[PDB]
């Protein structure tokens, strides 16, 4: 008795390998595609072509909830970038066709669900498609900065992110027609004290890409293959005191002597 000769003429379909544990519910699979920007973005991302260095790819947000004012729950999250696999070895998708409630009795494993029906005629298996294009997330996540307690970031999120008209009027009416102190800290304008911030912080907003490389660099503790030595202890502490006497006085009061690393 020969084993059934199934077709491989089948449709070729795209795939997405998420570095997430997506449960079987519609709510879960829906939330997962929303983290990538919706089904339009995912389908478009499979159609990108050209040198891998240039591909914009798909952007994944690990935090993407929405607050009561409709603003993003984590404005500023730099995304995990995914790209199409350059050479995806083709694989066949098989449909396994169990009786109702077989999967749960087998601790949700398909292996055990096959083995627990070894002699049955009910358990159909058939090939359904070949996959030959896949997006994988594989580069590191960028440096993340938290703006939850930065005064100007809260004013921006609660206006330009919420689209609330009361907040938007209050915001634009507060923007000076001309700024007389562009040299001074923005905290002098934004009075709000509900947030702990030091006056040494200028509320400088963070850049859209901090790690200019998605993969770790090859330092490997190797040097690249491609004079204070004469000074006295008093001369060295005097040079430090030229910029800040506090560190110089602290050093003189504590240290016993310099050493050249030779």
């Amino acid at each position: 008795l020969i084993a059934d000769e199934f077709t491989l003429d089948l449709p070729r379909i795209p795939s997405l390998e998420l570095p997430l544990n997506v449960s079987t519910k519609h709510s879960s699979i829906q939330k997962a595609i929303k983290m990538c920007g919706g089904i339009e973005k995912v389908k478009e991302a499979f159609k990108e072509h050209g040198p891998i260095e240039s591909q914009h790819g798909l952007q994944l947000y690990l935090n993407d909830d929405t607050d009561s004012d409709g603003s993003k729950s984590y404005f500023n999250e730099h995304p995990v970038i995914g790209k199409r696999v350059p050479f995806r070895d083709e694989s066949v998708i098989l449909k396994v066709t169990m009786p109702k409630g077989t999967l749960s009795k087998n601790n949700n494993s398909v292996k055990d669900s096959i083995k627990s029906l070894k002699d049955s005629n009910k358990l159909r298996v058939t090939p359904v498609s070949i996959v030959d294009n896949t997006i994988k997330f594989r580069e590191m996540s960028d440096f993340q900065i938290k703006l939850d307690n930065v005064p100007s970031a809260r004013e921006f999120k609660s206006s330009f992110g919420s689209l609330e008209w009361n907040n938007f009027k209050s915001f634009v009416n507060s923007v000076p027609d001309n700024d007389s102190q562009p040299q001074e800290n923005i905290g002098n304008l934004i009075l709000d004290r509900s947030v702990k911030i030091p006056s040494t912080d200028f509320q400088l907003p963070p850049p859209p890409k901090l790690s200019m490389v998605g993969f770790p660099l090859l330092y490997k503790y190797k040097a690249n293959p491609f004079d204070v030595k004469t000074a006295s202890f008093q001369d060295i502490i005097n040079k430090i005191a030229k910029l800040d006497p506090k560190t110089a006085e602290t050093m003189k009061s504590e240290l016993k002597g310099f050493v050249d690393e030779v």
């Binding site: 570095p19 997430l20 544990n21 997506v22 449960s23 914009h56 952007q59 690990l62 935090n63 409709g70 984590y74 404005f75 500023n76 999250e77 730099h78 995990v80 996540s141 440096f143 993340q144 900065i145 938290k146 307690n149 970031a153 330009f160 689209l163 609330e164 938007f168 009027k169 915001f171 634009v172 507060s174 923007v175 000076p176 027609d177 001309n178 700024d179 007389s180 102190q181 562009p182 040299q183 304008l189 702990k196 911030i197 030091p198 040494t200 912080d201 200028f202 400088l204 907003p205 850049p207 859209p208 890409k209 901090l210 790690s211 490389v213 770790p216 330092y219 040097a223 690249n224 491609f226």
Partner: protein
């Protein structure tokens, strides 16, 4: 009932906007139907009509469509009584930008931002709206990395130096904001910062360190200036031609640890967690994977807030996957990245 409430509210306002739009004396290329209506038109003041046009455009973009939001603001930009008032044109440009932010049109965003920066010269709240409007993705990096943006900001920085020293600087932008008061001749930290970002975000690390050191002289105890210096040294040290590689990495770690001390001491637990996460990510960037796992573990084990835990788990998964420890990667996946 919020989505339906927005639809019902839009449905009441659409009627009022139909009754105001059917006055073709304003909308220059239902006829020239209105003459001599001094301050109120069809029973409401021109101020109330301006307010209805803006509130409608925002509710339309929030609950129904971004392009429909722009069509409403574009009608506002064409109305003479709105165009003729300096307070209204200011408001109109910001409401337009806010709708543009929700569509991925890079060129539109870039042109709106350039318009506001030409108008409100040297203004701090506007410079922050510029950077915050550019916080995420390749679309915003394309804006900051463009040579157009590097030249534009160089010219405003030269114009500020002209106001700061009372002299003509070659290629300076015209001084539209003559209201500046800077008796101690200070830099504008925001201009020097944004210029350092434009260079950094276009791989000019040597140039980024110059303007960042010029910020250190004014604001040495700022978390971001410190971080951006540390990362500049690390990336700089990794280029082909840099001899002194080890020494530059030690300088990198010096500034990252300064950021670390600043964040961990003067702010709440959210920032403490951030400090541990970012510092770990720096060791990862360098390739010192063994040290990175300590910091990521602190992010996971010491604190309660889950937002950064996902990132700490994700990078740890990449490390453990390369180390062949698939079982730990799967435990992390279920514990932190589950849906």
């Amino acid at each position: 009932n919020e989505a339906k409430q927005a639809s019902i509210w839009i449905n009441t306002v659409s009627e009022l906007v139909d009754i105001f739009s059917s006055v073709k004396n304003f909308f220059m290329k239902e006829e020239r139907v209105t003459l001599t209506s001094a301050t109120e038109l069809r029973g409401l003041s021109y101020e109330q009509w301006f307010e209805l046009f803006m509130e409608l455009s925002l509710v339309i973009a929030k609950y129904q469509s971004v392009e429909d939001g722009l069509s409403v603001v574009e009608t506002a930009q064409e109305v003479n009584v709105f165009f003729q008032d300096p307070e209204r044109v200011k408001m109109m440009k910001f409401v337009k930008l806010a709708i543009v932010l929700q569509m991925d049109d890079e060129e539109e965003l870039a042109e709106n931002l350039r318009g506001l920066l030409n108008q409100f010269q040297f203004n701090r709240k506007v410079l922050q709206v510029f950077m915050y409007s550019l916080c995420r993705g390749p679309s915003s990096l394309n804006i900051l990395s463009s040579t157009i943006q590097q030249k534009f900001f160089l010219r405003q920085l030269k114009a500020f130096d002209s106001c700061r020293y009372n002299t003509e600087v070659n290629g300076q932008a015209s001084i539209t904001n003559k209201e500046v008061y800077n008796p101690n001749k200070k830099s504008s930290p925001y201009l020097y910062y944004i210029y350092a970002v434009l260079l950094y975000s276009s791989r000019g690390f040597l140039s980024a360190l110059q303007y960042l050191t010029r910020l250190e002289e004014d604001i040495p105890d700022d978390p971001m200036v410190n971080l951006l210096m540390g990362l500049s040294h690390i990336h700089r040290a990794m280029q082909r031609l840099t001899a002194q590689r080890h020494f530059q990495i030690f300088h990198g770690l010096r500034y990252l640890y300064r950021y670390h001390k600043i964040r961990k001491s003067l702010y709440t637990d959210l920032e403490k967690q951030e400090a541990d996460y970012n510092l770990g990510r720096a060791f990862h960037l360098i390739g010192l994977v063994s040290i990175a796992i300590e910091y990521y573990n602190r992010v996971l084990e010491n604190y309660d807030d889950g937002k950064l835990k996902k990132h700490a788990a994700y990078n740890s998964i990449i490390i453990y996957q390369q180390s062949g420890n698939v079982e730990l990667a799967d435990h992390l996946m279920e514990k932190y990245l589950s849906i």
